[PDB]
């Protein structure tokens, strides 16, 4: 029995052209170029899915370093004294408190200032 192809090669080619929606030029029309662009998008997303935990971490540090120089202190020193007083707090939380209730942060600095 001869099995002629049909309604299976265009059904899979119409699923790769729908994923490339919003591209500029003929990268959302032709399938030969759409497949290449969709094959690179997946390789990029996975590569920047671990770089998103490095940017935010560096952001908090910069914010905490700017809110620690107002009390005549340094990030390195502030952190050193904050670990000598036995305090378990995230860098994302410390920066979140500095932007909000400033009073709380002020008290924290004093606790890590007499612990040196």
């Amino acid at each position: 029995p001869r099995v002629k192809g049909g309604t299976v090669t265009r059904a899979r080619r119409k699923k790769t052209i729908k994923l490339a929606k919003g591209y500029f030029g003929s990268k959302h029309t032709l399938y030969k170029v759409a497949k290449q662009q969709v094959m690179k998008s997946g390789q990029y997303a996975f590569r920047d899915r671990r770089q998103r935990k490095r940017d935010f971490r560096k952001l908090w540090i910069t914010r905490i370093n700017a809110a620690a120089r107002q009390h005549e202190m340094s990030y390195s020193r502030l952190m050193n004294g904050l670990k000598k007083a036995g305090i378990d707090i995230n860098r994302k939380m410390l920066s979140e408190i500095a932007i909000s209730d400033e009073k709380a942060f002020a008290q924290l600095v004093t606790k890590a200032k007499d612990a040196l």
């Binding site: 952001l59 910069t62 914010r63 700017a66 920066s95 500095a98």
Partner: peptide
């Protein structure tokens, strides 16, 4: 503006 607590890049 790297001296503020609300600095965004």
């Amino acid at each position: 503006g790297k001296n503020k607590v609300t600095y965004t890049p």
